[PDB]
Structures are given as C-alpha cells and as structure tokens.
C-alpha cells in the first residue's frame, strides 16, 4: 500500500513545508 | 491476410511473407477442416476409426511380408508409406493413448529395417524422436549408440551409452558398446 | 543558549585547522605505510590485433592541498595578536549575519529538496532495473519469454543462441541506432573473424558485454531444467571467446596461426590436440602449413599449454558420516588431473592414495569447501580476439539420468592449479613412448591433483537404492577435453 520512496517523499515534503512556514513567518515581520 | 478457397475449403495465407507459427496454425486448421469434412456426425466420439486402422495394418503387413521374402528395400518404402498414411489420414481428435502406441510399434520396425539396410542418419533421427517423445528403454540406447559410432560421433556415443547403462547396468550389450566407444575415443584422442 | 559568533576571525581558523588535520593525518599515515604461473600473459599481446589494442586502451593531491592549507592557516594564526560565563560559537560572523544570510538557507533547502530525493530516486530506479545476477530486467524477461514458448523440436545451435542474444536490452542502451539484426550480423562477423569495417568499436563492446549475458542465459536455462540449451550456451561461449566457428575439428582451429583452406583440404583425420601431437614437431608444422620455426614455436607453446582434464576418483560424500543415508544432504567430490594434451596417461594405481582421501577432522568436515578455496586462481586465457583479458573459467553443472533435466543452478569454479603444465616437466611426452613413468625425473608426488567439490543442493531421496547422476565440467575459454561422467548414489541406510 505504501512504498519506501513514498515514505521518503512524505518526510521530505513535511520538513520542506515546515521550513517554508518558518521562513514565511520570519519574512512577514521584515516585510510587514 | 488470408484467402479462403471455395471448392477445397482450405484456408491459405494470401500474404507473401508469413510467420512460421501462423503457417503451422494454418496447416493445422486445414487438417482439422479436411478431417471434419470426412467425418459426418456432428458429435464425433474420440473412438478411433476402424477402416483407417485396417488399411494401416494392411500396409504394415505388406511391408513386413517383404522380410520373409528377404526383400529389404521395398519393405522400407512400404513401412514409410504406412507411417505417412497413419500420420496424415488420421484425424487429431482420435485417442492419443491409442495413436501413440501404434506409431511407436511401427516406428520400431522402421528403425530396425533402416538400420539393417545401411541408412544411419535417418535411423538416428527416428531414434531421437522416439526417445524424446516419451519412450526410454534399453532396446533404444543400443541402436542409438551403434548409429552414433557408425556416423563418427564419439562424445555423444559415450554419453548415450552411459545413460543406457544408468537404467539397466546388467545389460551384456551396453557394456560392450561402452568399451568399444572408449577404445575408439582413445584412438580419437591418443 | 545565546551563542556569540567569531566577529574577529580568531576562533574559526583553529576549528578549520582541526577539521582539516583530522582528515589529512590518517591519509598521510596510510600513504606512508602503504601463485599459478601464467604463460599467456606475455604471448597474448604478441598475437592480439592492434585494432583490439586500441580498443582495450581507449575504452593524492588532496594531501598536498591540505598540507598547504594547514600551513596557510598556521601562518594566519601566528600573525594574529591573540565573573560570568559567556557562551559562543566558532563559526565566523558574516556566515550568519552578513549580506549572504539567505544564501546559506537557500543552498541548504536546495540540497535537501533536489539533490537528495532526485539522486536517491535515480539510484533506486537503477538498482531495481538490475537482476542479482548482473543483467538488466528486460534482458532476463526476454530470455525467459524465449525459453517458455520454445518448441522442444528445434535443435539448439550457436546461431539460435546468437539470435537470442541479439535481443539484449543492454545493447540498445549502448547504441540506440542499431537494431537486433545488426547485432546478429556483428556477432557473426566476430565469430567468423569478419571485418565490420566501421562498427568495429561496437562489435568489440558487444563481444565484451556478451560474457555476463551468456552467464545469465545459462543460469536461466538451468533454472528451467533444460540441458540442450545449457550445453549450447557453454559451446557458444567457447565459440565467442575463441573466435572460431563451431565445427567437428575445432580444437585444432582455435590455434593462433592456421590456414583452414590448407588444413581442411590437406588432412581430415586430425581432429583433437592429442592426435595432432602424435606427429613429430616438423610434421606438425608441415601439416598446419605455416613452415616458420620462429612462429611454429609459438603455436607449439600454445597448443601444449591449454588444460585437459581427467578424473581420478568420482563419488558422493556426506560430511561427517561414511555412507549415503536416506534423506541426507551429500555433496559431490571430484579428483581431476589437469594435464596438457602432450603427456601420456598416468595409471590410477600410481597415485599414493594419500591425495584422494579426505581428512576426517571437525575443522575439515565442518565446511569441506575451505580446503578447495586454498587453490590458486586460474591463469589468463589465450583469447587473441576477445577484446578484454579474461581468466579461465570452468562451469560444472549436474543433471539427472532418469529423464535428463538439470536439477540445480550451474556452479562456476575458478580456483585450480596448472602446476602439471609448466615447462619444467616436459620430459613427459607422448612421442617418446619409453614408459616415462620409470624415469629418473618422474616422481608421482610432484604431479598436483586439483580437487573440485559441487554442493548438491537437494537431499537424497527417502527411498533405498541406487540413483544415478551425471556431472558435466566444460571449459569456457578453450575447446579442451571436457568431463562427461555418470555417478550413482547407493542409498543403503
């Protein structure tokens, strides 16, 4: 049902979304 | 592409370049058609034909009678004709366990006759077919090794001798054939 | 806590010095710190074509840079001038607060999002398309599909196996322009020693890659329990290695310098190497039609240095017991005598009976293959037309004698001693015919008897009786004298 590459993609996508949220909240203060 | 004849009802491929499997299937279908043409009943039984078997037996007896007349040449032609008729004019829906033993029994006589006459290659090929179609008996390995030694093929000769001895090592002929092959191969090498 | 970066460039130099020293030091330490005679490794290059040499040819500074970097940073530090605890870090300040503050994070997120997943996925897709044997998945699929709808009526020859090999998927990756028919034509030109003209660099590549393909085909054929295809595969491997068409008299055509138009027309009785060596050294040259002593010595040294085998004792063995017992796991023990085609026959009785028996010790009967694994490797083959250099190889496969089906995967042995072939024991010639066993230089303990052991992979039957087997040991580089023996396990309980 789940493949290993699916697991790696989910993990990397989660970490990428977390870092994107962090950098967005950081740049929101500098821009506004 | 393929054409369909009217008066003969035999399907032929109209293409100029046709594959091998297609050709085999076309010939098989032609055989099935030409047999269903002769066989009239729609619900045909796998029971073999009687007149065909009688004709085959008659041709085989005509071939075998030439042995008593010490006529070894025309007996081969008669046996070959009988085998070809039994292979052709017999519909494939006849019983397998009844068509196979008759073919074996005729081909064994053909083997012995062809080996006696002096033809060795046709004999070797017939033995190869008979051994590959499901009959493994020490009455075949002896003749196979004999033919192989006659047509100068020593490695497969010793291989066949060993395979024959691995079934009935108490044979008095297989051991002599193995010894002869060993000596001939020792000369072939040294 | 709240770290304090190096804003005076006084702490990161020492850290970089440590990081570079810890990687250079071991490398400098490692740099400061750091059986079977082959007669063909010399004569191979003397008979290989130059067009093949060109193909075989065509297709530490880290320590120094680290040392000079350590020197530079040491001079930099030496030029430098330099209650509550104040935590800090060693990295410089501009690395985190200068104008390149987003550069580091974008580089990091790129390395995490593109380099890692893409390369991991590519490596995975590449390591999944390969089989454990060493061939592509499409090639194995083609082999299996061709062996499935294979009519037992057609007899296997070399042409049919080449036709099968031309459908190899790995040949399309090498040359997306060529077609399988082109591959068949190239392999035919190679076997018949025909010049391709322009595609020689492709013919060499495909011949070099044919090795693993034929090994995979042999493994698959043994897996389907088919003997004709295995024998044809080994014979085709011989043919491709030696670049000589499979004929009745081919062991003598694999020699370096012979002219078929003269040899075939002149003689018709010399088929093997032994019947050849039966003639004198001048008659051999006169028959082969080369009439060049300086060149006849080369072919005489080649034809007297390829290995012919002969069994001494062949029987089943069970590790730890003495007889074959029902539902037990025995292995096959072979005692071969690697001899050249020139030496006469040594009787079995002359063997001192000490080299044939197996030592019965726990360290020995725990793994009977450890004693075999001590034999030296086989020398380089005499393959003047094969592109690369190969070591000899012997394929030992076993089949049953009831029906004639292969009952295990083929075992490929590589360790063997050719000590019986060296030019020191040359007084043992077939032409002297003077009972050379009773010679002043003949000692039966000098002839080394190599050993070959094949694990059976299947237990003995639960019944009681004699069950026959057949062991075939064919060569893979020459056309030498192979083994075709029968053996039976006498299950007795």
């Amino acid at each position: 049902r789940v493949d290993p590459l699916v697991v790696l993609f989910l993990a990397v996508g989660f970490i990428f979304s977390v870092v994107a949220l962090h950098v967005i909240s950081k740049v929101a203060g500098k821009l506004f | 592409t393929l054409e369909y004849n009217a008066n003969s009802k035999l399907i032929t491929a109209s293409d100029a370049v046709v594959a091998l499997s297609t050709e085999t299937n076309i010939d098989q279908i032609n055989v099935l058609t030409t047999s269903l043409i002769g066989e009239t009943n729609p619900n045909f039984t796998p029971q073999p034909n009687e007149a065909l078997s009688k004709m085959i037996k008659g041709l085989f007896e005509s071939g075998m009678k030439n042995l008593q007349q010490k006529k070894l040449n025309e007996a081969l032609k008669n046996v070959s004709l009988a085998i070809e008729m039994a292979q052709r004019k017999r519909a494939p829906w006849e019983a397998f366990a009844i068509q196979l033993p008759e073919l074996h029994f005729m081909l064994r006589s053909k083997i012995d006759l062809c080996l006696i006459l002096g033809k060795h290659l046709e004999a070797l090929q017939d033995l190869d077919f008979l051994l590959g179609t499901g009959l493994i008996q020490p009455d075949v390995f002896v003749r196979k090794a004999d033919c192989l030694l006659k047509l100068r093929q020593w490695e497969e000769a010793r291989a066949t001798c060993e395979r024959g001895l691995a079934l009935a090592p108490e044979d008095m002929k297989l051991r002599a054939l193995l010894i002869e092959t060993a000596r001939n191969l020792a000369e072939y090498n040294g | 806590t709240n770290y304090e970066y190096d804003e005076a460039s006084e702490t990161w130099p020492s850290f970089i010095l440590t990081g570079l020293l810890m990687v250079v030091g071991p490398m400098t330490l490692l740099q400061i710190y750091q059986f079977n005679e082959e007669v063909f490794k010399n004569l191979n290059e003397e008979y290989t074509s130059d067009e093949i040499k060109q193909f075989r040819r065509k297709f530490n500074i880290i320590i120094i840079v680290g040392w000079i970097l350590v020197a530079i940073l040491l001079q930099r530090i030496n030029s430098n001038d330099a209650q509550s605890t104040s935590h800090g870090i060693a990295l410089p300040r501009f690395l985190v607060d200068g104008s390149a503050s987003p550069l580091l994070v974008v580089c990091y997120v790129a390395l995490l999002g593109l380099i890692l997943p893409y390369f991991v996925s590519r490596w995975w897709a590449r390591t999944q398309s390969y089989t454990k044997k060493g061939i592509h998945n499409v090639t194995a699929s083609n082999f299996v599909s061709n062996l499935v709808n294979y009519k037992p009526s057609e007899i296997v020859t070399t042409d049919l196996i080449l036709h099968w090999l031309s459908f190899a998927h790995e040949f399309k990756q090498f040359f997306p322009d060529l077609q399988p028919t082109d591959f068949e034509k190239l392999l035919q030109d190679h076997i018949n020693r025909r010049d391709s003209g322009k595609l020689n660099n492709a013919k060499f590549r495909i011949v070099a890659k044919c090795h693993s393909l034929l090994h995979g085909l042999l493994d698959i054929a043994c897996g389907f329990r088919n003997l004709d295809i295995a024998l044809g595969a080994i014979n085709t491997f011989k043919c491709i290695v030696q670049a000589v068409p499979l004929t009745p008299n081919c062991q003598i055509l694999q020699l370096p310098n012979v002219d078929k138009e003269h040899f075939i027309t002149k003689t018709g009785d010399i088929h093997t190497l032994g019947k050849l060596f039966t003639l004198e050294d001048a008659k051999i040259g006169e028959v082969l039609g080369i009439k060049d002593q300086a060149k006849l010595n080369e072919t005489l040294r080649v034809a007297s240095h390829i290995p012919n085998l002969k069994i001494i004792k062949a029987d089943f063995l069970v590790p730890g017991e003495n007889q074959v017992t029902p539902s037990s796991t025995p292995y096959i023990s072979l005692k071969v005598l690697v001899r050249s085609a020139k030496q006469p026959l040594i009787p079995t009785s002359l063997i001192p009976e000490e080299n044939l028996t197996e030592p019965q010790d726990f360290e020995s009967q725990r793994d009977p293959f450890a004693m075999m694994s001590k034999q030296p490797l086989v020398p380089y083959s005499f393959a003047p037309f094969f592109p690369t250099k190969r070591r000899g190889s012997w394929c030992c496969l076993v089949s049953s004698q009831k029906d004639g089906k292969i009952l295990q995967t083929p075992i490929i042995i590589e360790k063997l001693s050719y000590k019986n072939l060296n030019d020191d024991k040359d007084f043992f010639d077939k032409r002297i015919k003077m009972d050379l066993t009773k010679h002043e230089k003949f000692d039966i303990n000098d002839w080394e008897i190599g050993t070959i052991k094949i694990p059976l992979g299947q237990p003995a039957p639960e019944t009681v009786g004699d069950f026959f087997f057949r062991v075939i040991v064919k060569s893979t580089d020459y056309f030498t004298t192979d083994l075709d023996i029968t053996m039976n396990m006498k299950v007795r309980d």
Binding site: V2, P4, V19, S25 | - | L21, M22, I77, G320, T329
Partner: protein, 441 residues
C-alpha cells in the same frame, strides 16, 4: 480481533542485497537525524536522562522520539510474558492482529502523551496555533514510526530503535570530542571540544611544554586523556566480543549437517545493564522526591540525604557512582560495597533474564530435541546436563564482566557512560555479525 484498514509499508518478496540495505539504512538515519534538529513553529521539566536515553530532544519535532514506540513494545512484551495474551504460533492471523494492534495502541498513546505534554508543558495555555502544533508533532510521530517499520521490514540492517539509540550515543561521544562551541570565563575563549581546544592551545599559546599539559588535564572540560581512555575501552570491549564457546553439533534426523552452536560471553549483553540503570534511576528519583517533599524523617534520612547536588549519609549514597580515583581513595568501604552491589546486580539480572526470556538451558535442550541436533561426543540424555554446566556460568560471568567494564569506564572518566558505549558497540557488532553470516560486502 477487529477490523482495521490503515496504511502500512509492504515487505519485499525477495531478499534485499547488502548495498541496497546499507544505503536505505543510511538515508533513513539521515532523515531521522534531520527530524531532530528542526524546531517547531507555534513555540514561543528538563529531564536530560530520558532525553539522552530514549532519543529525544526538547523544542524539536522529535521531542517524543522513540519513547512512544518503546513504551508500547514494552507493554506488549510484558503482556506476552505474563501469558495473558496466550499468543499461539500455530496461526498467523493472530500475529497480524497483534502487529496491527501494536500500531493502533502506539498511535493512541502518542495522542495522549502529546495532549498531556501540551496542556501541562511550559509552552503556555493560550486554538488554531495549538491545533497546528499538535498536527506537526502528530505527523512527525507517524513519520518516525513508519520509518521504524521500514527499517524492521527488511530494507534496513536491523531494528530502528536500537540503531537510533546507538547513533545518538555515538553523536554524544563525537560532540564531547570535537565541540566547536566555546566558553569565555575570565581567562579567555576556550573550545568545549577535546581535539579542537587541544590544537588551539598547541598553536596559539606558543609554549609547548606548558600548553600540552594544560590541554591534557583540563579539569573542567573534556581532554585528551578522556579520549584516549574511551577509545581504549572501546577497543577492549571489541576484543571481548569475540569470546565464545563453540560446541560441536551434528544432526540425527537429516544426517550430514555439521555446524557450531556459538555461546558468546555476553549472553544477554544489552539487558542487565539497562535494567540496573532503570532501577537506580527510579530509586534516586523516588529518593529526591521524598527528600524534597519530606524535610526530615528517620526513614527518609536513612534511605538518603541530599547535599552539596548529590546524595550523602544514607543508603542512596552508596548506590551513587564514583566520580574519579579521588572518591575511590576517599572511602574504600564505599567503593567495595558499590562494586559488589553493581556486580551482583548484573549477575542476578543475567541469570533471571536467561531464565525468563526463554533461553534457559532447559529451553535450549528442548529446542535441540525439536531440531534433533546432538553434541558430537555425547549422548541424547546428556545435552541438558551439559548445557547446565555452560549456560548459567556463561551468563553470570558475562553479566559480571559487563558490570566491571561499566564501572571501570565510569571511574576512569570516559567521554560517555559505559552503559551507552557498550550498548552502541553491541548494536553495531550485531549488524556486523549478521552481515557476516549472511554474506555481503
């Protein structure tokens, strides 16, 4: 038994080669480690022992770590040991139901632990931010449990929890050596790593005969002596791992199967030291709690008194580990009683563990009876009598030497605790011996 439809990774039908397994192990390790360095988003009691043992760190997506998985595994292990689960090996459906129940209870305990640490933690009582912070750690927990399932399915060299624990131990070791962080307290900036500050003092001090001995002692920060001692103890524990008793075995059902049944010196290596550590941890936890709650009592003063923090003048004072040779030479009776206790603990732990875990000599004799294997030069009715003469003594001596190694490391001042070093060494040696007996590069 119930109905369940939840996502799970499927095991490969064929054996995974060594290189494909090693690369996947490395990649899973990299992902698990990166998960431990990124902090949460909605953020605005310190227990360093549990966070160092159970692979967790505060303020990151891996705050739960492998603790939720290890809790469920221990719970089901106890439930199977108490024979209440009555797990029968004759059916695979029961095994699959147990394996899926493992996950369905692990996820619920994850939810519970997360909710309680959020509602009780020092993050703050003040809804969408709370829900998003919950989902972050939720998805992280599912990721880590799925990665452990992957590593256990066959794509990895072995289990995931033990691997991650060994990696965190090795990482603490390496950080106690090459720490780039510095501390400036009056004298100046000094690296918190052994090799780093060592080379720094060798270079900048310009006084070799003094800087060498100054960087070699370093009474306040790790030095070269500790590194030498820990690498020496690592190598000695390595050399001690090859010790084993090889008794010759043969088969009687299928004749001709000769092999060796290896009996290592470290029979149950990982268990006794970890049980001793958990016991001592609970002990001093209870002692500190009761000493802080109760000011003074006869029994409270008898069990343990805390002062300058450390316990002293009590029973809990004796159980505390020795710091260095100074405390050893201070109270020899304390050293004697502590060493005797720490050795007897591992001894009785090895004994009870080999008796409970189903590896007692009686169970091994029964297993031989099942397989039909016998000793080379002995009889059938003598295998149990022979195993009674090997297994118990071997287990007791292995526990004793493990205790001795641990206390020697703790006394000589290694970079890390001897328990952690031994655990990591055993976890890696297991992978090595598995790859050796299986066959791989």
């Amino acid at each position: 038994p119930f109905e369940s439809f939840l996502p799970e990774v499927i095991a490969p039908e064929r054996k995974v080669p060594y290189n494909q397994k090693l690369i996947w192990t490395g990649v899973s390790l990299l992902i698990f480690l990166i998960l431990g360095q990124i902090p949460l988003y909605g953020i605005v009691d310190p227990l360093y022992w549990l966070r160092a043992m159970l692979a967790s760190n505060r303020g990151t997506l891996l705050e739960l770590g492998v603790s939720p998985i290890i809790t469920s595994s221990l719970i089901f292990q106890f439930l199977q040991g108490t024979q209440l689960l009555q797990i029968r090996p004759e059916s695979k459906q029961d095994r699959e139901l147990f394996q899926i129940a493992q996950k369905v209870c692990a996820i619920i305990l994850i939810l519970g632990q997360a909710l309680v640490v959020v509602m009780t933690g020092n993050y703050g009582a003040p809804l969408p931010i709370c829900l998003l912070l919950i989902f972050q750690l939720m998805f992280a927990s599912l990721i880590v449990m799925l990665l452990d399932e992957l590593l256990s399915k066959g794509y990895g060299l072995g289990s995931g929890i033990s691997l991650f624990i060994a990696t965190n131990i090795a990482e603490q070791i390496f950080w106690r050596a090459f720490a780039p962080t510095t501390v400036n307290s009056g004298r100046g900036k000094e690296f918190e790593g052994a090799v780093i500050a060592f080379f720094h003092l060798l270079a900048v001090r310009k006084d070799k005969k003094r800087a060498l001995v100054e960087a070699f002692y370093r009474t306040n920060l790790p030095n070269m002596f500790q590194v030498l001692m820990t690498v020496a103890i690592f190598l000695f524990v390595l050399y001690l791992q090859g010790f084993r008793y090889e008794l010759p075995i043969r088969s009687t059902k299928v004749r001709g199967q000769i092999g060796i049944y290896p009996i290592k010196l470290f029979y149950t290596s990982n268990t006794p030291i970890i049980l001793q550590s958990a016991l001592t941890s609970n002990i001093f936890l209870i002692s500190q709690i009761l000493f802080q709650k109760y000011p003074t009592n006869p029994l409270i003063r008898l069990i343990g008194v805390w002062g300058i923090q450390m316990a002293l003048s009590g029973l809990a004072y004796y159980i505390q580990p020795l710091m260095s040779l100074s405390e050893a030479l201070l109270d020899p009776i304390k050293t004697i009683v502590y060493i005797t206790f720490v050795l007897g603990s591992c001894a009785v732990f090895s004994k009870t563990w080999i008796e409970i875990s189903g590896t007692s000599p009686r169970d091994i004799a029964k297993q031989f009876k099942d397989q039909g294997m016998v000793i080379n030069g002995k009889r059938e009715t003598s295998i149990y009598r022979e195993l009674k003469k090997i297994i118990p003594t071997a287990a007791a001596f292995g526990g004793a030497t493990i205790g001795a190694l641990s206390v020697g490391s703790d006394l000589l001042g290694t970079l890390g605790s001897g328990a952690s070093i031994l655990l990591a060494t055993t976890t890696i040696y297991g992978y090595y011996e598995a790859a050796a007996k299986e066959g791989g590069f």
